[PDB]
Symmetry: D2
Subunit: 295 residues, 4 copies
C-alpha cells in the first residue's frame, strides 16, 4: 500500500479582528471561521511515524492568528492568499496550502437614523466565503462565493411542459411559489502569485456585490420558467460583468410549498386561484446545479 | 397512581399564508410554526384506553390550517387567541388550549430602490413569538417575545468591582467586547376573552416594535457596567412605554471573545490597548436573566 | 419598576473527568455539560450597577472544575447536590443554586469480545440528565431524566375510536408504525440536605436503569391503544418500583410514517396490508405529555 | 456563455421499508435518505427554457419510492446501482445518474435477553453511506463509507518530535487523550454494469463490517504516534482484506481535550501525571486526511 494523497491542518478556527479609526472613533469588526490544510512531502508521517515533517496543527492555528494580526483580513480573497502563500514559502517541504474562509455578517447598527460607531447586528446567516488554493509553481486559484441567501417569491414562477410518462404525477402549473437558498460561486482566472492578487484587490468586493445584486434582481424580476432557466440568467449576467471570472456555479434547492385542499371541510376553497394557506415542506427538496463558462 | 397533569396536541406545524391586494397587485406573505396543546377531561385516554375523549392530533393539525384560512394570521397574538378559543368553545370537555407561534421573517425585497410586489428575503433568523394560554373561565394570558436577535459591541462594555475570592481569576476590565443573543418577553395583563384581545389589536405590533427599538438603542448607547445593569435599563423602558404590560423578562448569554497573547512571537503586542485579534469562544457562556415588574 | 426575579450564572460548561485504577490499569471516563444559575440578594447589580454582590460567571466556571476535581462526578444527582450546596454555603447572600447536568455517553469498547481498558464509543446521543435546585432552608429538589432515546416499532400500534367531527380526516387504524424520542423525568422526594442525598446514593443509578428498562420493555410489548395509554403504563411501573419518587413525567412525540399510495403506477399495491414503503415525516409531529403521581 | 456542467434532481428523500417474514413473524426495517442527481442532454432547459428534456424532480422522487417497492433496498450498494441504472436505461437523453444514500440505524431491541420481533432502537447517529455514479458506457463506480463513528481513548496517544519553529507553542507529549469522529470511505473497482454488481453482493456488507472492525480495533490498540500514523494503519489493513477495493480514504478530526491548571487554587495539582479534569474544546479541531491505494 502507498499514500496516494494526504492533507492535514486545522479547521473551525474562529477569528475576530477590530479596526479602530483614531481620527473618527469609528470601529469596524470582522469575524470569520478559517480552515487551512497543507500538502507536501509529508508521507512519512503516515507511513513511518516520522513527525519531523509535521508542522503541528496547533502551530497552524497560531499562524492564522499571527497572520491576521499583521495583515488586513479583508477582502477575504487577499487574506486567504497571504495566509496560504506563507506556508509554501516558509516550509520547504510543503507544496500546497488550501485555505477556506467563511465570513460572518456584523452589520453596523443604525440608531436614530445614524450609523453607530461600535455596535453591530447579525442580519441573517448569509455568508461570504472564499476557497484559496496556493500551489507551488502553479499560482493561486481562488473561488469566491455567497451562501445561505434565502429568498421566496409568492407568484411569477411557472413549471409546465416537462416530460410526462408513467412515473409522473406532477400537474403542470402557471403560478407557484418559488423559494430557495442561494449558493453561488465565481472562479477567478488563475493568479501568478501574491503580487497579482494584490493588483486586483478592488475587484473582489465589487464582484461580490455584483453577484449578490444580479442574483436578487434576476430572482425577483424573472417570470421563471423553471429553476434551471432562472439560474442560467443569473450566471450569464455575472460573467458579462467581470472579465476576470472564468466560471460561475449555482446550486439551488427548490424548497416546496404545497397547496392544502380544504374542500372536505364545508367546501372551503383553498386551491388554484383560491389558494391562500400552504404547507411548507421541510423535505424532500429539488436540487438544481449548473456551471456556466465562456463560449 | 393517578394523572396529575396531562396535555397533548400537535407541534411543528408549518404554515404559510399569502395576502393578495387585487387593487395594487402587492402580495404579502406570513410564515409561522405553530404548536397547540390541549388540556381537559382526558385522563381516561391515558388510564383506560378510552379514545372517545381524544381529538386526534391529526385533527388539531387540520384545525390550524382551517383557522388560518378563515382569519387574519397577524398580529400573532390575535391569531393565537382565536385558535385557542376555538378549542375550548368547540369541545365541551377541553378546558385549556396552549398555543405557541414562531413567526419567521420574510422581508420585502427592495430592487432598484423600490419595494418589490411579491419577492422576499429572510433577513436573519430573529423570530417574533407568542405564547397564548386560553383557559376556560380564566380568560387569555399572552406572552409576546422576540428571540434570536444577535448583536455585538466592540467597546463600551466594562466589568470591574465584582466579588473576588479564592475562586476568582478574572481580571477587572474597563473595555471588553459584549455580544449576546437577545431573548425578551413581555407579558400582557390577563384579557377576559377574544373581544378584549380584539380591542387592543393595534398595540401588539406597536409594542413589539418598541421592545425591539429599546433593546437595540440601549445596547448600543449604554456604557455597560455589567450585562445585569444593561438589561434592567431595557426592561424599565419597555414597562414605561406600554401600560398593558405587567412584566418584562430578558434572558441574555454573554458570548465571550478572549484576547490572544501573541507576545511569545517576536514580542507581538495584542493585549489590552493593543488588542486587535480575538478568539470568539463557542462555550461556555454567561447566562443572565431577570424579570422586571411594576413597583 | 422592580426586580421580580433574577438568576444568573454559567451555561454550557463542558467537563471531562477520568478515573484511573492503578491496580487494574482500567480507566473510566465521564463527560458532562453543566449549567449553574444562582439567585439571592443580587438585585442591586441590576438596579444600581453594584457589582460587589456578583460572583463573576467566570468564577462560577472555575468553581465547577474545582468541584469536579475534589469530588466524585457520579452519580450526577450527587455531584449536582454537592455543587449547588457549595454556593449557598460559601456565599452568605446567595440563597438558591440551580444546577443542570447533561451526561454524555462514553461506553467502553469491546475488542475481540473483551472490554478495553481505556477506549470508548459514543453509542447514540441518548442523555442522562439531572436538574438539582438547592434552596437555603428548603433542602434539595432533584429531577432526574433520560432524553434522546429514539425507538420505533413497525407494528402493534393502533389508533381507533377517537372523536370524529367536521375537522376529522384521519382514518381509524389497527396497525400503524409508532416511533418517538423518549423524554422521561422522575422527581425525587425533597431531601433535607447533602447528608440525606448521600444516604440514598445507590438508588440513583438503579432508578435510572429501571426507568430505562421499563420504558423499553413497555414500548416493545404493549399493543398500543394510543401514545397516551402506553406512556401511562410506563409511568405506573416506575412509581411502583421506587418509593422515593413522587412523580414521573413523560413527553413523547409521535413521529409519523405515512403510507404511500402507488396504485396510480401500474396498479402497484402499497397500502394497508400491502404497505411496505413509507415516507417518514419530519414535521409536523404529535406531542403527548403526562405527569403521573401517587393516589 | 455556455453550460459547462449541469446536474439536477431530488435531495433529502426519506424512505422507510419494512420486510415481514410470514413464517417467523419477524419484521426488519430499513430507513435511508436518498439523493439522485441526473446529467445528460439537458442544457436547453437552462438556456432556452425548454422543459421538454426535463424529468421533473417530483418524478424522480416518485421513482425512488417505486424502485424501493420493487427491489431489495439492501445492501445499499445494490439498491443505489439499480436506481441509477434505471434512469440511464429509461431516458435516452440522460447519460449519468449520481445516487447518494445515507442509511440510518434501527437496531433490533433485546428485551429480557431475547431479540424482539418488531421493536428497534436508534443506537447512535453513526451512518453507513454509499455514493453510486452510473455513467452510460463507463459502468458503475461505487464509494462506500461509514461516518459519524465517535470514539475516545483516554491514554495511549502520544505526539512528540514534530517540527518546532517560531510559530510553535505546543509542548511535546507522551500521554494525551485522542478523540475523533471517523469518516472512512472505500472505493470499489469499477463495475461493468448491474450484473457485475449483483455477482458481488455478499462482499458489500462483509466489507463494511471489516472496515468498522479494523477501525475500532486499530484505534483501541495502537499506541498512537500521531493521528496520521494511526489512520494509515487502519487503511493498510482494509486494503489487505478486500482485493476489490482500490483505495481507502480516511478523514479524522482531532477533537481536543485540554488540561486545566488549577494550581492557582490552593496548589491543586491537575496537570501532567495528576490530570483528572479536562476541558473538552468544541473548536478549533485538527483535521487529518489521507487516501491510501495499492503500490
Ligand atoms: O427540474 C425541475 N425544475 C423545477 O423548476 N421544478 C421542478 C419540480 O419538480 O417542481 N423540477
Ligand atoms: O455576572 C457577570 N456579569 C457580566 O456582565 N460579566 C460576567 C463575566 O463573567 O464576565 N459575569
Ligand atoms: O392523540 C393522539 N394520540 C395518538 O396516539 N395518535 C394520534 C394521531 O393523531 O395519530 N393522536
Ligand atoms: O498534525 C498533527 N497531528 C496530531 O496527531 N496532532 C496534532 C496536534 O496539533 O495536536 N497535529
Amino acid at each position: 500500500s502507498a499514500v496516494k494523497a494526504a492533507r492535514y491542518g486545522k479547521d473551525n478556527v474562529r477569528v475576530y479582528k477590530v479596526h479602530k479609526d483614531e481620527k473618527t472613533g469609528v470601529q469596524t469588526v470582522y469575524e470569520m471561521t478559517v480552515c487551512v490544510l497543507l500538502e507536501g512531502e509529508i508521507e512519512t508521517s503516515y507511513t513511518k511515524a516520522d513527525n519531523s515533517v509535521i508542522v503541528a496543527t496547533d502551530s497552524i492555528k497560531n499562524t492564522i492568528y499571527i497572520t491576521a494580526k499583521q495583515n488586513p483580513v479583508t477582502p477575504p480573497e487577499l487574506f486567504g492568499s497571504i495566509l496560504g502563500t506563507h506556508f509554501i514559502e516558509k516550509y520547504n517541504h510543503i507544496h500546497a496550502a488550501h485555505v477556506n474562509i467563511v465570513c460572518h455578517r456584523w452589520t453596523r447598527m443604525d440608531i436614530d437614523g445614524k450609523p453607530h460607531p461600535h455596535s453591530f447586528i447579525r442580519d441573517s446567516e448569509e455568508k461570504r466565503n472564499v476557497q484559496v488554493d496556493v500551489v507551488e509553481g502553479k499560482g493561486i486559484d481562488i473561488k469566491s462565493s455567497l451562501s445561505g441567501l434565502t429568498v421566496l417569491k409568492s407568484t411569477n414562477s411557472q413549471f409546465w411542459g416537462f416530460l410526462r410518462d408513467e412515473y409522473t404525477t406532477l400537474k403542470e402549473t402557471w403560478d407557484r411559489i418559488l423559494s430557495t437558498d442561494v449558493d453561488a460561486t465565481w472562479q477567478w482566472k488563475n493568479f501568478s502569485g501574491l503580487q497579482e492578487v494584490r493588483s486586483h484587490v478592488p475587484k473582489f468586493d465589487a464582484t461580490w456585490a455584483t453577484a449578490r445584486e444580479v442574483t436578487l434582481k434576476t430572482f425577483a424580476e424573472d417570470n421563471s420558467a423553471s429553476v434551471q432557466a432562472t439560474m442560467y440568467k443569473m450566471a450569464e449576467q455575472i460573467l458579462a460583468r467581470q472579465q476576470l471570472i472564468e466560471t460561475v456555479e449555482y446550486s439551488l434547492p427548490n424548497k416546496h410549498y404545497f397547496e392544502i385542499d380544504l374542500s372536505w371541510h364545508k367546501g372551503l376553497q383553498n386551491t388554484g386561484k383560491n389558494a391562500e394557506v400552504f404547507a411548507p415542506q421541510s423535505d424532500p427538496n429539488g436540487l438544481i446545479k449548473c456551471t456556466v463558462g465562456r463560449s
